[PDB]
């Protein structure tokens with residue numbers, strides 16, 4: 001029913017933040033050099049309070065607000081990212097490029113990072129049914145990243161989230177059928193063809209690698225919690241691997257499957273729930 005369906009959208013959005021917050025605790029740490037992370041303790045290189053997240057969730061929130069206030073508007077997305085960037089003390093370059101030229105698609109070919117993946121969920125929640133969803137995802141990535149593999153990885157995640165929200169089984173999600181044999185960057189091609197079945201040696205910042213790490217954690221985890229712990233304990237760019245895993249696993253398992261203690265400790269939990277529901281209602285209208 002309605003509740004079950006809403007649960008998936010709320011799960012994907014909140015899961016993103018939960019993963020960001022948990023992973024942030026061990027960001028930059030080499031795999032296997034620290035005790036297993038299992039709870040929201042805060043910490044990390046930014047000495048975050050428990051349940052607090054990073055730029056991953058910040059951008060996701062900005063994108064969410066942009067979509068709700070004016071549909072798909074990359075210019076407005078960048079106005080918001082820039083406004084958040086300046087109030088704070090590859091992406092910074094994209095923002096300054098936009099500030100100087102007015103070009104909203106300020107990503108360059110050097111941007112192959114995972115930034116476009118960490119903030120994706122909001123777009124799929126609101127434009128789930130749009131026939132050009134994958135194209136909108138590419139445009140959303142292009143605002144800050146322009147490398148072929150980053151754009152394609154974003155399209156793959158957009159597909160994954162849409163299918164997961166629609167109830168597709170784990171086996172179908174991991175099979176990535178529409179991408180099999182597709183003309184993709186070699187690195188991403190290796191991921192789609194099964195590269196993710198092997199455990200990563202660390203949490204990668206490279207888009208294809210981040211996607212592969214999230215897919216691995218999703219494949220091996222039997223529930224949201226188990227998969228999330230697998231993802232963040234890879235260390236490295238754990239906040240982002242955690243955020244990507246969170247989006248996919250959140251849409252798949254639903255909000256009700258995410259540990260209550262993680263959600264209760266999450267900063268701006270209620271504001272995100274409101275945004276997720278607003279975005280979902282938006283996908284059912286116009």
Ligand SMILES: [Mg+2]
Nearest residue numbers: 054055056239
């Ligand atoms: Mg981050």
Ligand SMILES: [Mg+2]
Nearest residue numbers: 237238239240
């Ligand atoms: Mg990160």
